[PDB]
């Protein structure tokens, strides 16, 4: 009532507390470990148009273990805090891996527009998860030009989010019909980094 | 009603839609007098596009109404003025007696013309269009009020009937300049009347 004097009567006040007095943790009995160590250190990462996908289950997913020798210039999370990573459980764990150009890195996100996002790899707007991106010029590049990695440059329509398309049909850039063989204004959609 | 059982009365469902079913692009040829989707220089709209009788100045392109809307538009290729009307009209209500009683229903569309079908007996009335009911020409007291002097009920083989309201029984008075009427007998009548006095007190702790 915010005064030193109160007239005779009855008054309503704050609620009864009843303290918790105990903290209890219930948890499954899983004792395995994630294959993240070999997944991140994997010798071969596929091209952007042929991005590699893997499903993980029944293992333990500590993330501090990466930081022993981790080197990630680009890190991003959506829909979750990395801090809480060790304090959560995750029903489905799907890991996608690929190699791209650094200038195209900004294209990989929810809602960004560009060549990769519209032709190679698309992500839903309600997506939750993480993106880990590091430069690998010291290992994935070689003298004389490394062209093992390819990308899709031409496509009839933009792909859906989480869509894997590896069609290799000659795209018809011009009005002249494609005759099942290379022709003018008819190009192979794949190009080499 | 979020329920599996419904009491006797009338209820609101939704406003009517009337689909455009057509898109027109004006930099599509010019189309007039049909409820369509139209575009004018990037501006999107929907409705029936009919003639105009205004006097747009040569630099005038859009003539706007108060609610952010434009009622008169100039074509970007033939530069003549046309008037626009959306036609998403008519609230829909369902008249039904008790669910425990029957299952047939009647449908009332408000302020819409029967000539404008949009729907899939039919009766045009001052309230709009009324479907499912059969019309009669007698009088009874009110059971479920439709509107504008029309009231409906469920009756016997059994269906739903709409009829004009009955004000009351006819009567006339034998008035003159030397006549009087006197009672001879009396009755004691006992009647009931009911009044609420209070409601249920409540308490809410906002913080929790």
């Amino acid at each position: 009532l915010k005064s030193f004097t109160v007239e005779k009567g009855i008054y309503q006040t704050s609620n009864f507390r009843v303290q918790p007095t105990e903290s209890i943790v219930r948890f499954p009995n899983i004792t395995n470990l994630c294959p993240f160590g070999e997944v991140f250190n994997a010798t071969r990462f596929a091209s952007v148009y042929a991005w590699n996908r893997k499903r993980i289950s029944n293992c333990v997913a500590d993330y501090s273990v990466l930081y022993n020798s981790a080197s990630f210039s680009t890190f991003k999370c959506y829909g979750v805090s990395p801090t809480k990573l060790n304090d959560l459980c995750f029903t489905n764990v799907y890991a996608d891996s690929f190699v791209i150009r650094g200038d195209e890195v900004r294209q990989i996100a929810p809602g960004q527009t560009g060549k990769i996002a519209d032709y190679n790899y698309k992500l839903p707007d309600d997506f939750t998860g993480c993106v880990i991106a590091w430069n690998s010029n010291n290992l994935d590049s070689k003298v004389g030009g490394n062209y093992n990695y390819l990308y899709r440059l031409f496509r009839k329509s933009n792909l859906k989010p989480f869509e894997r398309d590896i069609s290799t049909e000659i795209y018809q850039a011009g009005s002249t019909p494609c005759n099942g063989v290379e022709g003018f204004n008819c190009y192979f959609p794949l190009q080499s980094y | 009603l979020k329920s599996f059982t419904v009491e006797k009365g009338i209820y609101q469902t939704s406003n009517f839609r009337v689909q455009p079913t057509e898109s027109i692009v004006r930099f599509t040829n010019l189309v007039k007098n049909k409820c369509v989707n139209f575009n004018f220089n990037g501006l999107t709209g929907t409705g029936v596009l009919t003639e105009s009788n205004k006097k747009f100045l040569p630099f005038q392109q859009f003539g706007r109404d108060i609610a952010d809307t434009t009622d008169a538009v100039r074509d970007p290729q033939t530069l003549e003025i046309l008037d626009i009307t959306p036609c998403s009209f008519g609230g829909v209500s369902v008249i039904t007696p008790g669910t425990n009683t029957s299952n047939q229903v009647a449908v009332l569309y408000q302020d819409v013309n029967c000539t404008e079908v949009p729907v899939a007996n039919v009766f045009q009335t001052r309230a709009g269009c009324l479907i499912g009911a059969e019309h009669v020409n007698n009088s009874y007291e009110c059971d479920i009020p439709i509107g504008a002097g029309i009231c409906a009920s469920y009756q016997t083989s059994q269906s739903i009937i709409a009829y004009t309201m009955s004000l009351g029984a006819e009567n006339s008075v034998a008035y003159s300049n030397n006549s009087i009427a006197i009672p001879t007998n009396f009755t004691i009548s006992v009647t009931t009347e009911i009044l609420p006095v209070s409601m249920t007190k409540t308490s809410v702790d906002c913080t929790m």
Partner: protein, 318 residues
Amino acid sequence: YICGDSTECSNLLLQYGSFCTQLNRALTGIAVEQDKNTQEVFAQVKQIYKTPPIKDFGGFNFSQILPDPSKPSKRSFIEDLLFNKVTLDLICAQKFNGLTVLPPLLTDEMIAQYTSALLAGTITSGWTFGAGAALQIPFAMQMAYRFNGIGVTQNVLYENQKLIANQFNSAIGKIQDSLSSTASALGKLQDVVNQNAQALNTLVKQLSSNFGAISSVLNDILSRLDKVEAEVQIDRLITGRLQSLQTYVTQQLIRAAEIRASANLAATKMSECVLGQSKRVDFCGKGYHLMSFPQSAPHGVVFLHVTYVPAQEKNFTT
């Protein structure tokens, strides 16, 4: 009104719960009360009494207030003056934005029939017909007993009968042209309509606002923006429009409360004055009350009070 068609805006609006239902419910309650008001005020007679054959009431001319036997429409003379005085574009803009106006239940012709029955019954049977079965009695006798109700011995009336008649037909005349000179009297009806307009002409132009968004039309936002900024810019429009609708609904609720109170007063006045004789001072205007006559009006009621006033005093020693 919130979404202006299109699906994305309704999709977002679904996340704001079901605010969209209870305001519909409140408006429904308002309309049902509006019906119940008139039905309760005017239907206090259960019998439709016909206009009496022949006209002879000792010299009282009733031609102005009784309905015209020749006119197919039953509006009386004074009722014609009133129904012509009070009147009733954004009218189409109301329907263009989902603002539906609903028709009233009774027809004003039915109101004419109700009031005509009330007048015929009162002038043909006094106050008896309110009790039960109607019983006829001559008019001069009724006037005599109504005087005796306020203490004047009835003999007075007869010995001045003709004189009294000359006043009444004059006084109503003074009322008649009165209504046709100034309509400032009908203002208490007119305001009831006028306020309504000031609400809607606000609620419609309330669409022109922005609430911080970048364009006040939803289609412009959808055309100019992508699928991730649309929500962050349209949430503010949704909030603002929901706010405006709530404000309008609350104003309607309060004004309905006041109109309901006035309707209760109208019902009490009709029951106590027209249908009987009341000793309550000043409940029927200045002076001792003699009788009353009701008349319809656009969403309202008019009462004519007929009263008794002394004059030309003289001194005496007591």
